[PDB]
Structure formats: C-alpha cells, structure tokens
Amino acid sequence: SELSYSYMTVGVGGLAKLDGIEGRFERFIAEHRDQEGVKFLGKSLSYVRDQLGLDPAAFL
Amino acid sequence: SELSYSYMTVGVGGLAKLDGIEGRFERFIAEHRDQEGVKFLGKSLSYVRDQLGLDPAAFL
Amino acid sequence: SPFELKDELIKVASGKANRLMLNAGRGNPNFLATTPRRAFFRLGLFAAAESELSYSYMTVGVGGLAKLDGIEGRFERFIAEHRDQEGVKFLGKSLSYVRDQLGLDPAAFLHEMVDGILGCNYPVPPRMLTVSEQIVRQYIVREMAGGAVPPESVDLFAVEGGTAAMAYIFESLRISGLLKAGDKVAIGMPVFTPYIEIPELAQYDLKEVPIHADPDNGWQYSDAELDKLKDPDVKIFFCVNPSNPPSVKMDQRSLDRVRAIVAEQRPDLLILTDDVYGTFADEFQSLFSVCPRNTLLVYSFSKYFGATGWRLGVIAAHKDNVFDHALSQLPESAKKALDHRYRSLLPDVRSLKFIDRLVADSRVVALNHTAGLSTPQQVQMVLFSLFALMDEADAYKQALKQLIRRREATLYRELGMPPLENPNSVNYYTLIDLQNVTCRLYGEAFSQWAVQQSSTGDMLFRVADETGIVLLPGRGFGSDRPSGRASLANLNEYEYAAIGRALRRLADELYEQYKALGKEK
Amino acid sequence: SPFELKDELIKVASGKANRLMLNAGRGNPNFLATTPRRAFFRLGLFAAAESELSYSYMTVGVGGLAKLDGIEGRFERFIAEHRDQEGVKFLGKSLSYVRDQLGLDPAAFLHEMVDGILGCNYPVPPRMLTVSEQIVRQYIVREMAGGAVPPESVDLFAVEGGTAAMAYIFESLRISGLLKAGDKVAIGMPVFTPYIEIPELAQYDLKEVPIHADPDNGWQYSDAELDKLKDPDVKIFFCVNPSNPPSVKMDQRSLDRVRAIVAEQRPDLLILTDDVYGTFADEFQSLFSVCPRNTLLVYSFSKYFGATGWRLGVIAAHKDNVFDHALSQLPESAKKALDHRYRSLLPDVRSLKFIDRLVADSRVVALNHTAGLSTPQQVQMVLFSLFALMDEADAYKQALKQLIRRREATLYRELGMPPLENPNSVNYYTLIDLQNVTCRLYGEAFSQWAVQQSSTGDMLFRVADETGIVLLPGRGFGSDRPSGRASLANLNEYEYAAIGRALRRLADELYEQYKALGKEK
Amino acid sequence: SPFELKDELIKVASGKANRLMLNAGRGNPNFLATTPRRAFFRLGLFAAAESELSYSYMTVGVGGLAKLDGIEGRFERFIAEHRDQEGVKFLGKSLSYVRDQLGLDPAAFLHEMVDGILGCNYPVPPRMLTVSEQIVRQYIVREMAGGAVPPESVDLFAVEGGTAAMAYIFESLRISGLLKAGDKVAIGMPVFTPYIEIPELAQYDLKEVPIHADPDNGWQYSDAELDKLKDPDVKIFFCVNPSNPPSVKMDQRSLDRVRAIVAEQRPDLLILTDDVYGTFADEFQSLFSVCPRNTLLVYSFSKYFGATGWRLGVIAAHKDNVFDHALSQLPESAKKALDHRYRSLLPDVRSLKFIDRLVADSRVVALNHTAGLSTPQQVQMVLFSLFALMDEADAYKQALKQLIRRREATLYRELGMPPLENPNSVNYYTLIDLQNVTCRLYGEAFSQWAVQQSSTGDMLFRVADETGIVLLPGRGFGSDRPSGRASLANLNEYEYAAIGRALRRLADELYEQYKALGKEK
Numbered sequence A, B: 001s002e003l004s005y006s007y008m009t010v011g012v013g014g015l016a017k018l019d020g021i022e023g024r025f026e027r028f029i030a031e032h033r034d035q036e037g038v039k040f041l042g043k044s045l046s047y048v049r050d051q052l053g054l055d056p057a058a059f060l
Numbered sequence C, D, E: 001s002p003f004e005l006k007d008e009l010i011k012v013a014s015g016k017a018n019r020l021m022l023n024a025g026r027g028n029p030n031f032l033a034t035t036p037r038r039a040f041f042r043l044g045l046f047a048a049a050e051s052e053l054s055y056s057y058m059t060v061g062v063g064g065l066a067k068l069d070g071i072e073g074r075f076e077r078f079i080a081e082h083r084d085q086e087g088v089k090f091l092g093k094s095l096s097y098v099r100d101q102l103g104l105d106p107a108a109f110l111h112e113m114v115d116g117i118l119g120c121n122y123p124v125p126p127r128m129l130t131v132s133e134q135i136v137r138q139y140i141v142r143e144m145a146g147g148a149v150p151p152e153s154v155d156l157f158a159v160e161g162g163t164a165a166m167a168y169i170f171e172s173l174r175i176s177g178l179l180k181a182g183d184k185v186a187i188g189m190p191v192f193t194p195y196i197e198i199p200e201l202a203q204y205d206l207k208e209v210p211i212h213a214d215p216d217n218g219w220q221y222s223d224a225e226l227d228k229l230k231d232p233d234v235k236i237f238f239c240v241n242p243s244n245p246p247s248v249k250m251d252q253r254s255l256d257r258v259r260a261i262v263a264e265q266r267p268d269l270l271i272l273t274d275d276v277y278g279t280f281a282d283e284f285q286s287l288f289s290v291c292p293r294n295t296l297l298v299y300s301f302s303k304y305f306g307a308t309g310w311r312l313g314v315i316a317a318h319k320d321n322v323f324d325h326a327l328s329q330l331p332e333s334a335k336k337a338l339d340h341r342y343r344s345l346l347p348d349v350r351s352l353k354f355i356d357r358l359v360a361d362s363r364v365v366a367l368n369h370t371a372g373l374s375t376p377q378q379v380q381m382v383l384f385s386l387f388a389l390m391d392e393a394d395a396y397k398q399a400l401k402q403l404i405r406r407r408e409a410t411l412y413r414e415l416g417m418p419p420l421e422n423p424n425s426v427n428y429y430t431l432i433d434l435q436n437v438t439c440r441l442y443g444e445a446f447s448q449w450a451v452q453q454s455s456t457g458d459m460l461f462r463v464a465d466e467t468g469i470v471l472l473p474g475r476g477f478g479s480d481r482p483s484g485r486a487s488l489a490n491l492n493e494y495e496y497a498a499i500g501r502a503l504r505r506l507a508d509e510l511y512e513q514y515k516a517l518g519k520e521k
C-alpha cells in the first residue's frame, strides 16, 4: 500500500497492485524466512496453488 | 549492467534487459527502503504508473 | 616381466596418486576448478529452498517440485542477496551468457538447472538435458573444432566419463554391426595399456594395426604411417589426441593428411578420437575438426577441471555422419533383426540415429526411458563448461600451464634442466630419458656407457624406492633405452624435486664408475 | 492394440509426469528428502574451502586436495559456525552416528566424504568407497533384512540406479555363464512391461515362467505357484518386492515357502530381487532376508527420497553366496577362458567374487580401475542413508504414508471412497477398478451391466482426455475388466480429485443408461 | 537507390541497435566501463551529504554549497567507511593520481569534483572546469599524442560529444572567416555519409576533394593521394582516425608524409581530425601527434567507455596553432567587425584564442558566461579518464580487444573463418566481402560467378530479413562488389553467428546453381 500511494505524504497509502505480486510476496517471504509466522504464510501459498490449483496471484 | 555482461571481467558491464525489470527494481527498493533517496525513487514509479498511467516497465 | 614388474612395484608404491598411475597408466590432477564448484553448491542451496517452498504441508524434511513460473525473478533475488559469495557472482553471469550469447530461454535454462540439481526427475530426454546439450555442446565445438562446425549441427551423449564413453561406443558398434568380428582397426600409437586391450577381447576379436609415432620427430605420426588408413579394409581409426603418454597434438601436417585420405580414398572411414588432454593446449584442432562427418568425438571433463570423481563426459557426433549412412549400406537381413530389438523405442527403427542408439544400448533398451547421466552431474558439467566459456582471458588455462612449467622446472633441476619446449607438447606427461639426461650432464662420451649399464626397470624401481613414486615406462621404442614417464599433474613441487634427487643420485653412482673404471685403462 | 493405444495417448498426455508413467510404467515422486540435500550442498561449501586452502599459489579459480590431518577439528569448526542452518545441524550428527554407533574412523569418514564430494579422485576401490560401503550397507541390511544378516557379511556395488543394476547383473551373468542361453527364469507377476523384456532379448534368448499373483487374495503369490521353483531347471527367480503395479510385499507365508524350497530342494537357486518400494512399508522383510546366500538384492534410492535424478543404487550380495559357488561347479574349459579375460585384474582369476566382476564387467574390464559411481553420488547416497538411519521416529516415513493416504482419499472421494486397507499394500499405486467402484456407488445390479458396457481403454482415454492424466492399464487379469492403475506418488491433491471427477462423470453417463434403458422394459 | 534502399530496410530492421547503425552509420557499443560509473554515483552520495550538511535550517529536501575547508579529511573519512564498495575503492586512488602523479591541489581537485557533481554552479570557466581540464587533457595527450606534446601546452574544450564538437568547429570557422565560402577541403575517405554532408550545406557551400584509401593495401592512404594537400588552395584537412568504416589507423608512412608536406610546403594547412576509435588500438599515433600546431583534435568518450548517452568530448588545440596565426593574417576590415561581435567578452578582441571562441560562438556570445558542458558530465568524463589513466595493465583495453576477436570469430565461423589480421585495423567494423568469402569457401572458380550473380543490396536485405540485422554497404570501391560492413561492437555472439548462418545459407543457394547449371554444360 505505501508503495502505491504516489505522493510524498507519510500517513497515506494506496491500493495494492495485482501485477507482479507473486514475485513480491516471494521476496518478502525469503527476507523473513526466520519468523515463525512467515514460514507458514509461505506454504499456504503452495497449498492454495499446488493442491487446490487456484490462481496464485489472484489468491494473494 | 554488470549482471548483463556475460564474461568474467571486472570493469565491463552490458545493457539492461527490460523483461522482469519491475520485479527487480522492486527488490532493490525494498532492500534500501532506509535511504532517504530510495524512499522517493519508489513513489515516483507509482506516480508514473498510477497517475500518469504510463507503462511502468517502459518507464523504468 | 612388465606384469610381475608392476607387481613388486605396488609392493613399495606409496600413495593412491602413484597407485592410479600404476593401475590406469594415468595421472590424477592434484588441482581443480573450484569456482564452478562453489557455484554448484550455491545453486543447490537456492534449489533446496525453491523445493521447500513448493511442499504445501507443515513437515520439515519434505520438499516439492520447483515451479517454472516467475523463476527468473526469484533466481535474481537470490543472486542479489548473495552477491558477496565467490560462487554466486559467477552463478549469475552464467545466466547472462546462457541468455545473451547463446540466446536461449533463460527461464527454461534456469528451471532445468534447478530441477536438474535436485535430481528429482529422470533425465528427459535420456540422451542429455535439453539446454545442457546446447550449452555443453558449445564448449566442445569451440575447443575441439571451432573451425567449421556450427554448434547447431553437433549431437552429444552424456556419459559417465570417457571410460563409460568407450564401453558404450564399442559395444554399440558390435550390437548394430557397424563393426563385425575380425575387422581392421587403426590405432595411433604409442597408447597406454588399457585401450589396446578392448579390441583384444573375445566379444570383439579384432586385429591390431599400429600407426607408429616417430620419436625422433617429437612423437608425430609419419606421413607414411598415416597412409595405412588408405587400406579399404581398415574399418575405423582409434586415436587419443593429444596422445597419452607422448602428450602431443597432431600437427597441421598430420591432420591435413587424414583430411585428404578420408576425403579422397576413404570416405567410408570411421574415426573414434579421445581428445581429453585437448583443452590444456594453447590452440588445438581435433580430428573432429577436419572430419566432422566421419568422427566420434569423446571428451572427458576429468583432467582439465580436476574433476575425475564426477565422471563427466560426452560423445560428440555430427548430424550427418557415416555411422548413420553405414547403418543403411546394411543387409536387409540384419536390419529387420535390429527392428525386433529396438521395437519398444518407436515405429520406424531405421530412422534411429547412431548417437541415439549408444543411449538405448547402454541400459539394455527396454529401460531407455530411465537411462542417462544424473541430472546433478549434467548440471555440474554445464557449470564447468560456462566456466570455461566465460574465462575470456584464460586466466585458468594460463594458470595450469605455468603449474606445469614449474613442476617441469623443479623435476629437471638436478638432471640437466628441462627438454626442448615442444609447441605441440602439452606436457601433461614428461619423458625423463636416461640417455638425454647424461648427454646434458656429462657428455656424449659418458652417455652411451650408462645407457647400456642401466635399464628402464632399474630406474623405475630406484625412484619408487627412494621416494615412493611410481614412474611409467617408455613404451614404444627399440626396448633400447631406459626412460621414465613422469606426470606433471599428479604431484607437488617437493616430490618432483625428490624424483630428481634420486635420478641424479643414481646418475652420479654411474659416473663414479665410468670415472673409476676408466683409470684402470 | 496396447502399443498403438499408448501411441495416441501420448498424443494427448499433458506433462512429463504422466509421460514417464506412460513410457516407463512408473510414477516419479513429486516430493523429496531435502534435509540430506541441504547437508550435501553445505558439505560441499566446506569442502570447497578446504580445497582452496590447499592450493598454494595466488590464483583465484584453482584449488587443491583436502588434507586428512587435523580434519575433525576443522569440520568441527565449520559446524559450530553454521549451527543455524538446517543442513549443518544434521551434517554434524551424521558424524556422531558414523563414529559413535558404527564405530568407524571419524577422520577417515570425513575425508572420504569431503574428497568424495569434490569428485577430484577416481572411486577407490571401484566397487564402492570404503566407508560409504560400511555406512550404506548398514542402511540396507536394516530395512531389507534386519533379521539375520550382520552388516559385516554383506557386499555392495555402487551403480547408476536400479536400471544400471540390471543391465549390469544380467550381462554379467551371461559373460560368466552362471546363466546359459535357453535357461528357465522364474518371474513373479504381474510386473511392468520393461523387466519381462530383458530376457526377451537376442543376447539372452531365455524362456518365461510366470508365477501368477492371485488377485482375489490381494495380489499375493499362491503356495502352488511358488512351488514351480522346485523345478530344478529354473535357474533363477526374478522378483520385485514390493510389487509394481500391485504395490504389495510378500507376506510371511510367501516368504516362508521360498525359504523352504530353497532350503530343502533348491539350494542351487538364484534370486534377483528388486526391493525398492521396500522402504515405504511399515515393517518389511525382503527375500534377501530369508535367503541371504541365494539372493542378489537390488535397492534403488530413487523412490523413497524422491531422488530419481541422482540415479543411486546398490547391488547387495552376501559374502558366501551361490553365485560364487556356481562359478566353481563350472567346466574347467570356460574357467581358463575367463582367465584370459580377467587377466589384467589379478593373478588368481578364480578367486574373483561375482560381486567384484559385476564391476569389472560394467566397463569392459581393461578400465576397471576407473569404473564405479561418481564420488559425489556416493556421498549424496550416504547422506540419504544416515538421514534414514537417524530419523528414529520415522517422522519422514510417517509423513509420506499420510501423503499417500491423503492422495488416496482425494482420488476416491467421488468413487465410493477408498478400498479395503491392505496391511501388505504400500499403495504407491492404486487400482481403480470399474466394477468394484460401481458396486459401491449403485449396486451389484448396475455393476455387471457397465463392466460389459465399457473397457479399460475407454477409461484410460476418457481420463487422459478430460484431465490430461495418463493411467496405467490393469495387466494380468482375465482381460475381463476395465481397471485403472493410478500412482499415488506422482500427482497433487487437485489432480487426483480431477481423475475422480471424470471417472465418476463417466460412471453417471452409464447409470443414466441402465436407468433410461431399463424403462423400456 | 541507396536512399529508398534504407527506406524499405527500416521497414524490416528489428531493433534500435540496428536502427542507429542504419541512421547514423555507426554501431552503439553493447558494453560499458562500470567502475568509473559506480565511482560516480558513489561520489554523488558523498556530495549529497556534504550539501545537506551545509544547509543550516531544519528542512528535509534542501541542501547547500559544499565547503572547501577540511574537505580532504572528510572525503578521506567517506572513503574508509566504504572501502568495501567496488566504486569507492577506485574513487580513492583517483585522488592519489590527481595528487601524487599530476601533482595538483588535492583539495581543489576534490571540491571541483564534489561541487561539480551536484551541478549547482555554472561551469566556471565555460571552456572547461579548471582541474578537469588538466586531468582530462592528460588522458588525451597520452593516448592521442604521447610523442611530443607536453600536456601543459594543450587546450581543451568541453563539448556535448563529437557531434557537438563539429557543429561548433565548422560554424566557428565560418563566423570568424578562417574558412570562406568556396574553399577546398580535403577529406580522407571512405567516410560515413554524415560528415561529407556538412560541407555540402548552403551556409557553407564548399568543395569536395576526395583523398582515396587504397583497398588493395588495407585501406591506407596512397602517398600520391596525400600529396594533394600540397595544393595551396586546399584550406583544411578532414580526417577520422582510425577510419569509419575502414576501421584503421594511418600507418607510420601516412603520418610521416603529412608531417613533411605540412612542414615543407603547407605550414598554412589546417587539420581537423576525429580520433575517437583511437583509444581501442594497441599503439596509436594521431595526426595531432605529428602536426600539433596545425591540428584540431576531436576526441569522443562515447565509443571506448560505452558512454554514448553521456555525450562527452573535447576539442584539443595546441596553444601556438595556426588557427590563431591565421586570425592575424586577416584583413583589418573583418577584424574590426569581429570586434563589434565579441565586444562583451573583453577589451582586446584580437587576443581571443580560437579555442576560446569556439566557446563564445556555441551560445551566441552574449551568454558566454553560462555556456559549457554540465558540471556532472565534466565530472563523469574526468572519472572515465582517470579510469584509463590508472588501468596500468590495460586489463580493460585487453578485455574489449578479445571481445572483438570473439565476435569476429563467431561471425565468420560459417564463412571461411576470419580475414587477415591487420595490425592497423581496430576491427570495430568488419568487412564481409562476398567475393573473398567464396574464394575461401569454394574456390577462385565459383567466386567470380556469384560476385556477378548477386549484389550488395541483396546481401544487406537477405540478412536484414532472416535475422533482422542491418548491415552497412561497402562505400568507395568500383560499385563492383557486394560487400557487407558489420560492426563488431553492437551485437551479441548469438546474433553475429546468426548473420553468418544467413550469409552462408545464401552462399550455398548460389553454389547449388554453379553446380546444377554447370551440369547442363
């Protein structure tokens, strides 16, 4: 969100774009693989994608 | 550039590929969100993309 | 004698280094290309993580299959977060080269590499992993040929190292008949024991045809000698270029001839060349260069990158080669026989390229769809290739040369300094010749005396006793000279100097005789 | 029909996953043991560094040979400085186990591993790396036998995966004669296409002897059927335990018999068992258990650890086995013949164990001293072993079972739920039987009607058309029932459910006929 | 024809790379010097911080002017706190070199660089930033001259790239009259389209005087041809050294002559040399070498450092040059005219050096005090210089050479291998000559036939159609040979090979005619 709000204002934030979102989610995941929550927050994406076979990006 | 010059030579560097460039710019941005310049270098991308509505990748 | 000789030699031989020399008549490089190695391990680390992030349940040991979608992005991330490590810096540029110079599908390339290193899938196709073939083939056609061959015209077969390469080729030849029992096979010599023993088998029973290399002219093959292939009953030519033990490449003359013979009077000729010591040389043209449609090129990654243990090699073969024509000029009988064999493979068994058979042959056909080299190996091999394809200065190649020159220097320090630098010698092996040594140490006089006073065998045991180092004999002369074949790539500065310390210690024991037994005159 | 069938199936088959099933009649695991994998890459990283710190000149790419002196200390350091990474935590305990449970030379073990992973030296001995053999053999005798066999009595041969294991064993048998043309070979059935094709070759020309497994009794071999081996002219027994496609282990009864037969009336019998699906099972006894001196055990690391691409396997063989006795009860003629062959190997060719030949045979003897499996592979394989030897809870084994049960559940959700849980079934493969399915969905009435209204072939294409998934046929019945063989280890939850969505979509198309065509009555 | 040719070529031309070639008859380097680039960005980062720490109020965006006092200390600090980054390591040594080899005011140098990169002040003086001139001039006199010229005697003018350099020089010549309408200008040829069009203008209306380069003698200028300058009515000489498209330097002979002519019979001669491709060459002497007082040296940083987009160049000019003498041998009329023009500049307008005018001319005098090249650019250019001045091994220069040799090799792999290595060729551009190609592929016979069967234009379109690559025509022959001018610096290995794949695909289409149409004889 903050990276979608185009002006230089601190509190505000915009709408998350959908294009290229797996890549980004993926980045976030690797940069935090240490935290107990993100380890799971990742596999979920697998399951939503590899077992339910749904649109990963959509899902995210 | 350095990551486009295919031989093992230190000074040289090649031409920036356009494919997948938002992802990368995005990565660079998140890994430096601390520096006063990159915080802005990011929002610009929004504005070029969300307000002027231009080809983000092209722009980058 | 030279079978009970080696017998008691082992009895003293100290090492493995010297024991392999003694058992396989080859030296195992005490050095190795590490950069591609690190890149490999590093690539696995990234791969390992892709996998864990594809196994959807909460279980620690398990991991799934790497997805292909979005993979450049990720590889790219991994690269930037580790740009510090010596291996990943290279693991990145490779991607450039595969993409910006070979112009291949980057993503495709990556996923083949990633999945390839996790060795979690059967080699598809068995012959060799799609891109790995386009990459590694590029390495070969450049070092070996470079001259004519567009890489797009070469086919490769991933095999467990030259060794496997042979046991595959021969057997394959016999299975199909491109080679019938009692055929004439030309053998460039001198060659090391092993190869002159594959034809000397029962399942082959073929006949030798030495093609002697002229010592007095730097172990080059004599114009005459090469003309023997003119003889229309000599089915195939067997060469190791550069040669082992000589350690030399076939000069422009040597090549040109075969080029002609094959071209003028022998287009039916088959060539099986083992051009491993090939890459060491500054400039090098392989028989596969001059006769691309009549040759079967065997390259082993083992010597140059110190990677013997990986067992990495390829069997190169043009797309329009005789081996495939010959499978045509065959009696309609055998054809329909083979068609019963390769019946599971496909519908038209008469379209099956030879190269493609070597494969099917290797694992008794029926398993074909599970034959091939391990995906990890294919990957490592690829990495070793791009490491060579991107070392534009040859800093690595330059480094080894000098590593030889030095081992050379040290060896001969106490034996009349090093020999005449042969521009076609690769020096992987050096020939310590007793005569020549003394003709440099004391003079033409003394020389002749000791050459008759001592034997090769005394040399080889005198050294393997004082030091513990095995030295190969001088095969293919007039059995008239004690000579010593040392490898300049399997030992350290202090050991080579030790070799000399003995050879010279002994060249003095003699001189003290020629001296003391002369005063009786 | 079943050769042009597969023909047009491929024409629609979507994948590689399904394409291998179709081509090799086997499922490639969509999962894999990663911990040992990470440990591997991590081990290389340490190895890489040992090497750079052994290459004495100032050159970046090059690296030398790992010294053995002081190596535990160093490995220990590396371990403590990385205790954070998932792989090194395990890479450490291994060292314990190799040292505190197997009681082997720790340092020795390490240096073999380190040097082994840098694949910079030829596999010495070729058969299998010293400690790797003592370790990996420990894995085998425990899972496969466990009963009698002291690991110190088993010999192992490192080969490129089961596949290689066969092409080595058979050929080796023929070379030496423990198998003569026109012999009787017992084949436990049903088995998948490939294996019943190796004997059906020209270089063998042997005769089949099916040993049918009784479907109505969970694909177990019938007492009678096994008695055929009593026939003194049946030279060897060929089994795959657990079976493929059945996917079951030979119960205590089945074993006991062979145990007797062999022991009472057939101590001349040879056994070649492929016990890969062996490890999946909770408890499992391999034919190598009961008849250790008459069996040749082939184990492949490929299915259990998802490591097909590594091509890792062993050929187990007791030290006192018939294969070696039989090489004695041989005409003095052949003996002196073999003695010409294996002449380079040693002095007394009549002492050469069979196991040891399989080796020499594999690369046309003369190269023996360069044959064997890549040192990296040997290492990985070892790591996969200790990973299994140290998973005391079986958390990994438990994890896969459940991964099967689930894929099972999902598949049969819309087809009358899962079958009767067979305590001897490993379920790697499931049998979707049209009859049984409908007798659970609609009733004995409807069943009989559709079984005659549809064929296996319609099933297999109906599915491979709606989804894109290849399904194996039901080999070995009365060709009287459309059945479907699905693998529970090569696909994902959503795809299996997709299989069902079709099978059931089709089981309704029929029911709407039995319904609508009944009202005309 | 060659204007509607290019027309429909664009219609197919795929790229920008090939589109610039086509539009400017020049190749844009697909490579670039990055180290100086990083140093630049890094320098700005330090500069940015100096500035914020000079803006005394609490406002985030704003920043002030970098103080000069104590600046080495600070730069030094910044350097030590970043010695890890590839750019700052170099950004430091530069300071040494500027201080320990050129012996200039370190602090001065730094502050000019820092303030220079923040581009917050007008270029003072407009001609070129004080130290930047002393540094960058050092680069020029060394590569270009090196022979005589003490750098302290050269003057430089910072301009927007060669391009600007011309439009400045010519116009400047006309404004002042050192060039009057209808003068004779000598043009070394062949040259690319653009330059032979500046004189062909209305605001100039001058006359051509080709000075042909002899193809049969490697595009060198023939003794005779150069003698034309002897003609006292030829006001100036226009050369591009090395030449474009030929890509060669004027050998020692060529130079010596002009050296003489100028010296013996033409000290009134003016020389305008564009020595950009100058630096690529191993050793190189520029016309500015031999005739320092009669030449105007134009150097562009764009090709060598891949920095076309920066538009960086200089106009070198001795301190005692004719251009300044000539402004004296002028009618007292014009003099007092110019004195009205350059009236704002100073008191004595007859002291104004030519170099200094080029400046004033560039922005319609009145603005002189705001003309010049951007301070950032001046800085980058300086950094590119010191990067060249400190690469003592030429590792960069060596790297590009090889990058050419390789692109060369790849191109000609399927066209009779590469041409005769010319020691004066820089190879930036290669000449694919249809004749020569076939005389290497098939023979003198075939050659002559196809040379008349095909045209340059078919070549250029055949390639730009199969691949999408634009190829320059062979200007300046007897319009008698299809030739192809490829640039070895604007494409990748896989594309050049693609060029060949076509050229050769086409050299076979012909051979199949000479072959098939010969059999009718």
Ligand SMILES: *Cc1c(COP(=O)(O)O)cnc(C)c1O
Pocket (backbone or CB within 6 Å): C026, C160, C161, C162, C163, C164, C240, C244, C274, C276, C300, C301, C302, C303, C308, C311, C312, C313, D370
């Ligand atoms: C050592 C060497 C090679 C390498 O054999 P691999 O299976 O590839 O290990 C090949 N041929 C000869 C003559 C050699 O000296």
Ligand SMILES: *Cc1c(COP(=O)(O)O)cnc(C)c1O
Pocket (backbone or CB within 6 Å): C370, D026, D160, D161, D162, D163, D164, D240, D244, D274, D276, D300, D301, D302, D303, D308, D311, D312, D313
């Ligand atoms: C898949 C499987 C194996 C593994 O073969 P590898 O060479 O070891 O890949 C062995 N036998 C059967 C019956 C199989 O199903």
Ligand SMILES: *Cc1c(COP(=O)(O)O)cnc(C)c1O
Pocket (backbone or CB within 6 Å): E026, E160, E161, E162, E163, E164, E240, E244, E274, E276, E300, E301, E302, E303, E308, E311, E312, E313
């Ligand atoms: C490309 C090139 C240059 C560079 O021109 P810039 O303004 O400096 O971009 C100069 N002259 C010729 C002949 C060229 O080929």
